[PDB]
Each structure stands twice: as C-alpha cells, then as structure tokens.
C-alpha cells in the first residue's frame, strides 16, 4: 500500500531567522508527490538517509521508535519511548523483548523531556548526521481517513541529541506512513513572521525549475532558459603505446 | 598516562564548557604550538560549536608532518589534516615517559597503504599489503608485507628519533549554538545607543533595540540579504534584539 504525500515533510533547514524572503537551500527533503509506504499493524525498516514518519493514531497506540543497527545486545541502540507524563530517550546495549526491553547494559546517553505525541495528524522527521540525531515535528488537525493531508505545513525542530551512534534500521513501537529523504533543492517561502508557508521542489517538473530559476512562486507568460542539457560519457578508453620494456631506474638507485 | 599509536589515534569530543586556551599557550612545557585558521592570542575571545582533541605519539622528525598540505608516511597513511584546517597543533618531548632501555615497541605506525587517507580518517586494520601483482591471501612474504611498524623508542636516541606526544585541537564553527567559549566576562546589556557588541562570538557595531520579530525557540539570530546579522537572541535573557547601524 502506498499514498501520495503531496508536499508534506518540509522542515526548517536551520536555526537562522528569515522573513519576507524566498530562500534556496540544499538538504535532505521528502520529494514532492513521492510514494509513501502505508503500513498497517510491524516490520523492521531501513533508515537510509533519514525518515519521514506520519500517523493519525492516538498517543497510547504509537509509543515510540527504536533506531540502530543490529537492534540487539551486540551494539548501542537508540530507544525513544513516550508515556502519559514524559518522554524518555536512552542509548544502551538493549536487549529487546519479542515493557520494551529486558536489559539495558552500557548506557551512554539519557534524556528526559515532555511527551512527543476529526483527528490529529502527527508528523516527524528523523535525521542522523555527524553523531547528532535530529528530530522535527508538527501536530495538525486532519479530516481524512485513507490518505495524507493536502496543503503546506513546515516541521519545527523538536530536539537535537548528541548520541554519537550509527543508525541503519528502525522499528515503530506499538497505521502509519513511512517515506525517505533525498538530497534535493528546495525554494522556501518565508512570510513576514518568519514562517515557511510554501515551497518548490526544483526537480519536480519543468515548471518548478522555472520557478526556482526565478526566485519567484509566480511565472509570467514567456519563454525562459532554466538549465543546460549535456550528454555524459558512457565509458573510458585508454590508448597508450604498446612498448613493454621497463625504465632502468633501479640502475640509478643501486649504483 | 597512556597515549595512542598514531595509526590508531584517539579522539575526544569537547562541548558545553568554558575553554581557557592561554594556560596552554603561555606554558613553558610545549615544544610546538602552531595554529591554523586562527591566531592563538584570539582564542579566548572566540566561541565554537564543538572542539575535538586528537592525541597520539610520533617521533620528533615527524612533527612537521602534522600540518595542512604535508606529505610523508604520517600525513599520508596515519593522520591527515584538511587543507582548510582550523585548529592548533601542540607537541612536547616525552622521552622521559615513552622510551625504555632495549626499546619500547608499543608505539606503532602504518608504513604501507593502497591509497592516502582522507582528512581525519582512521585506519586500524592489519591486513597484508600487496606490493606485487600476485595476491597474498593473508600470508606475509615476498611482495606481501605487514602494514605496521614500531618506533622502538630508546632513551639514547637522537632527538629526531625520540617520542613526542601530540595533541591536535580542531575547532568546529557551524551555523549552530556555540557550546564552547573562552572565559570572557559578560557586561550589562545597553540599548538605544551606538555600541560595540559581542553576542556569543558574534561581533559588530550598531544600535540595539527590543524586537517584534517572532523567533522560534531554536532560532538564535536573523540575517539580511547581505549575509549580515540583523537580529540576535541574547544568550542569557533569551530576549530578541534588533540590530541597526549607527
């Protein structure tokens, strides 16, 4: 099962305040109109270069996530668990069961804060760059049953954890949607309050590239040069002389 | 007490603290103290997002290789700095600790490698090096070498062959909240007047006023189209201030 995430998964790329400006940035974003996998439940999934996660389930249904590699007692794993009053984030040599784990040896990181989680759609973005596990989130009202919501809403930084571990796989702790981030170029529109209200995926289509080339979200009638095409080399060919005698360097060195 | 071999160099991450660099620079104990991308006399005025401290042992003649743009066995196969490196290299003679009679063979370095290391890359494998065209299959012999070698430090060695302990401090300066700052004391905030300012490492001149800009909790400053900061969050009061030129 797949859904179309129309323009979802946009987050504030940095901590710089901007307003009344169109800003072009390079980062890991969910491509517009990509195919997002719709899960019903609970398999272990690849983390790849970052994960877009969304759900309409209650906070007492989706408890949190496990991120790591082997997801067993052999390596450090990141455990994010919510409850009625708080959120607990730990990195340990966890041995997971099947209330989440039976053991947690060699704990290196602990963080405690407030809970992370017509219905209400919850969106999260998980990145792991240079040892920092970055989480972005947004909570909005939803009136849909079978698909993702339309319209634009940017996700704000929630927490930035100096965990220092590698993540290749993850699992959700218990329906939800999972997409993956890619290195794209986006044009982000900041309003007078510094809120991102729109965005253009510059690789979505010829119209979007025109918009990105122009630093404008509207295009007037006309013809515009947006890029160059160029054919890439299919292969490399080496053509040297077919002599075989070796240069007498050894004779110089061992005189 | 114990330093790493250069091929297996140690790294420590330093954050969320006050860094006084003058105690190191003004010391009489270090034979080498060389900074790149920054002057040592200004370190106490600066703020960084992170600091890394790398440490290892090499012989005296090799200290020159611990610099940007260097070549040789250490720069090539053991510990490589970037060309745009920002940080300081500190070294001192450790003959009194690391040498012994008959030779200390604990300290080792990589002698052979298929290719040069990338900056800040670490390689601790001990696989057999293939010098010839014929595969070694993990066996040492003709054209098949063990990649590592020892210094064998002895107290009677010439200075170029004596052990030196090296610490490399690399300064990470990203567009992010600085967590490591020098010991500069803060003053009271002055508004509606032309002043010089220094906000968590950000220096400039202008008039400061209360701002109506609605920063989100993560946001620390704003910028204009000229890449100039036009608003800051005060690191102590968390108040948002506008910056305009005098």
């Amino acid at each position, epitope marked *: 099962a797949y859904t179309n995430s129309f323009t979802r998964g946009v987050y504030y790329p940095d901590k710089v305040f901007r307003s009344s400006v169109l800003h072009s940035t390079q980062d890991l974003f969910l491509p517009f109109f990509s195919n997002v996998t719709w899960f019903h439940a609970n398999p272990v999934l690849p983390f790849n270069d970052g994960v877009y996660f969304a759900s309409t389930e209650k906070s007492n249904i989706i408890r949190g996530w496990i991120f790591g590699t082997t997801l067993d007692s052999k390596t450090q794993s990141l455990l994010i668990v919510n409850n009625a009053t708080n959120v607990v984030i730990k990195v340990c040599e966890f041995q997971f069961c099947n209330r989440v784990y039976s053991s947690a040896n060699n704990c290196t990181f602990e963080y405690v804060s407030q809970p992370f989680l017509f219905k209400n759609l919850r969106e999260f973005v998980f990145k792991n760059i240079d040892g920092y596990f970055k989480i972005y989130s947004k909570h909005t009202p939803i009136n849909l049953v079978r698909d993702l919501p339309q319209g634009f809403s940017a996700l704000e930084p929630l927490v930035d954890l100096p965990i220092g571990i590698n993540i290749t796989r993850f699992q959700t702790l218990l329906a939800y949607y999972v997409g993956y981030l890619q290195p794209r170029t986006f044009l982000l529109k900041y309003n007078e309050n510094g809120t991102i209200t729109d965005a253009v995926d510059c690789a979505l289509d010829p119209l979007s590239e025109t918009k990105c080339t122009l630093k404008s979200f509207t295009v007037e009638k006309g013809i515009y040069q947006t890029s160059n095409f160029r054919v890439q080399p299919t292969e490399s060919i080496v053509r040297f002389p077919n002599i075989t005698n070796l240069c007498p360097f050894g004779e110089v060195f061992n005189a | 007490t114990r330093f790493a071999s250069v091929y297996a160099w140690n790294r420590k991450r330093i954050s969320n603290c006050v860094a006084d660099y003058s105690v190191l620079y003004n010391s009489a104990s270090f034979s080498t103290f060389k900074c790149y991308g920054v002057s040592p006399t200004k370190l106490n005025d600066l703020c960084f997002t992170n600091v890394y401290a790398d440490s290892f042992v090499i012989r005296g003649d090799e200290v020159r290789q611990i610099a940007p743009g260097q070549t040789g066995k250490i720069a090539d196969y053991n510990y490589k700095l970037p060309d745009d490196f920002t940080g300081c290299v500190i070294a001192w003679n450790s003959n009194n600790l690391d040498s012994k009679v008959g030779g200390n063979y604990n300290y080792r370095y990589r002698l052979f490698r298929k290719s040069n290391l990338k900056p800040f890359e670490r390689d601790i494998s001990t696989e057999i090096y293939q010098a010839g065209s014929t595969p070694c299959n993990g066996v040492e012999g003709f054209n098949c070498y063990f990649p590592l070698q020892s210094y*064998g430090f002895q107290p009677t060695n010439g200075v170029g062959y004596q052990p030196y302990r090296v610490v490399v401090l690399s300064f990470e300066l990203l567009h992010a909240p600085a967590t490591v700052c020098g010991p500069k004391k803060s003053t009271n905030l002055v508004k509606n007047k032309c002043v010089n300012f220094n906000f968590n490492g950000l220096t400039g001149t202008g008039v400061l006023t209360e701002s109506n800009k609605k920063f989100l909790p993560f946001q620390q400053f704003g910028r204009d189209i000229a890449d100039t900061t036009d608003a800051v969050r005060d690191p102590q009061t968390l108040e948002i201030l506008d910056i305009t030129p005098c």
Partner: antibody
Framework: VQLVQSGAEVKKPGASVKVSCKAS????????MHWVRQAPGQGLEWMGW????????SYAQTFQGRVTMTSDTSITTAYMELSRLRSDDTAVYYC??????????????????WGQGTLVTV | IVMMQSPGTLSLSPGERATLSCRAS???????LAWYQQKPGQAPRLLIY???SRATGIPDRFSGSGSGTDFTLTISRLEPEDFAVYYC?????????FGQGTKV
C-alpha cells in the same frame, strides 16, 4: 649489534628443544630473525624465519610441522623450538639477522649478523 | 637449486692470492649471491653481499664477482687468519641455500 644465544643442551629422541636469541643494538622489529643449522663436519642449512612485528613465520620444507618459532618484543628475544628430536638433529644452531622483504636493496637475501651458536646434542 | 663450490680444499702460502668458485644449477641474480667466512670454533660472518659488495668492517683484501651461474671470491693477499672455510649463499623462491663450503 649483538646476538646472544642460550647455552648448549643435551636431549633424548622424541623430545623437544628450545633455543633463545637475545638481540640488542638495533630496532628489534625492523628485522627478520632466521635460524640456521650446522651438523658436525657439515655446512649450513636454513630452517625458517620469524618477523617479530607481525609474529609471522615461514619454514623450510624439511622442518614443516616439526619446528615452531616465536618472539617476545618486551625482551627483544626470539626462540626456536624443534620437536620430535632425532639423533641427526645434533648440530650447532645459529640465529641470524636479515632485512624484511620490503627492503629496497634486497637486504632480505642475506644474513648480516650472527649469534654465536648453541650446541644441541640428541 | 644446487650451489656447487670448488675446489673442496685449497692450500697456498700466506701473502699469496687465492680464488674460490661457486656454480649454480640455474641463473642467480647478482643481488641474491653472498659469501660467508667461518673460522674454526666460530659462527659464519658475512664478507660479500650482492655478489660484489663488501660487508661492514671487511678489509678491501676481499672482493667478489660473477653473474648468471658462475661466481668467484678473491682474496688478494692471505693472512694467517684467512685460512678458514668459505661458503656461497643464494636466495630465491622464498628460500635461502648455502653451498657445501670450501676450506682454505
């Protein structure tokens, strides 16, 4: 450079003997240690080598499975152990130094320093 | 491979010149040919390495030469100390081989 070997030994058939060679005056791990045997009235036979840095070894076909070589860098000493001894293993045993195989000028091909030998009678 | 030295025994007066030979069953690179001297009751010592190069501390009274299958050690003027056993040594195919030796 000095190479100093253990004293003479007397053994019976089926037994094992261990000969030590202590090195000094050079970087121990920078050279291979070879063992060479000399029976009474006879010439010289190469047995094998050990590389102290890697603890890697190689042996002559004659002694494959019979001989073990080891080293201890903390005392810059190499050892040769020969098992299942026979009467024709009676010989003077020498340790000798040679360059490693990566030596540019082929210093690995010859033995430049010798210890005074250890007499073993079986 | 086989390394063959000749003559098995040589006799001449002190102050005279001596030459010893070494023949290989196959070609040997000059870099892989060496000569050793062994006095009575002593370990062998290196005299010549690489066919023609003297070892450290060895008098210029000694010299060597040869290529391919045939090599020779020359002692220009013999002292009372030079009446020892000499060996030629070869390297190849991951093994070290000695000649049978000759007595001066």
């Amino acid at each position: 450079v000095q190479l100093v070997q253990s004293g003479a030994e007397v053994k019976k058939p089926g037994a094992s003997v261990k000969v030590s060679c202590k090195a000094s005056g050079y970087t121990f791990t920078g050279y291979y240690m070879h063992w060479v045997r000399q029976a009474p009235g006879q010439g010289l036979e190469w047995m094998g080598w050990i590389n102290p840095i890697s603890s890697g070894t190689s042996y002559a076909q004659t002694f494959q499975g019979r001989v073990t070589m080891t080293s201890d860098t903390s005392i810059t000493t190499a050892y040769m152990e020969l098992s299942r001894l026979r009467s024709d293993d009676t010989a003077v045993y020498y340790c000798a130094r040679a360059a490693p195989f990566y030596d540019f000028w082929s210093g690995y091909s010859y033995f430049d320093y010798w210890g005074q030998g250890t007499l073993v009678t079986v | 491979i086989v390394m063959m030295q000749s003559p098995g025994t040589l006799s001449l007066s002190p102050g005279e010149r001596a030459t010893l030979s070494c023949r290989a069953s196959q070609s040997v690179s000059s870099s892989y040919l060496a000569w050793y001297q062994q006095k009575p009751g002593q370990a062998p010592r290196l005299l010549i390495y690489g066919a023609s190069s003297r070892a450290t501390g060895i008098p210029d009274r000694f010299s060597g030469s040869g290529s391919g299958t045939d090599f020779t050690l020359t002692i220009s003027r013999l002292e009372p100390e030079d009446f020892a056993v000499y060996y030629c040594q070869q390297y190849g195919s991951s093994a070290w081989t000695f000649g049978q030796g000759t007595k001066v």
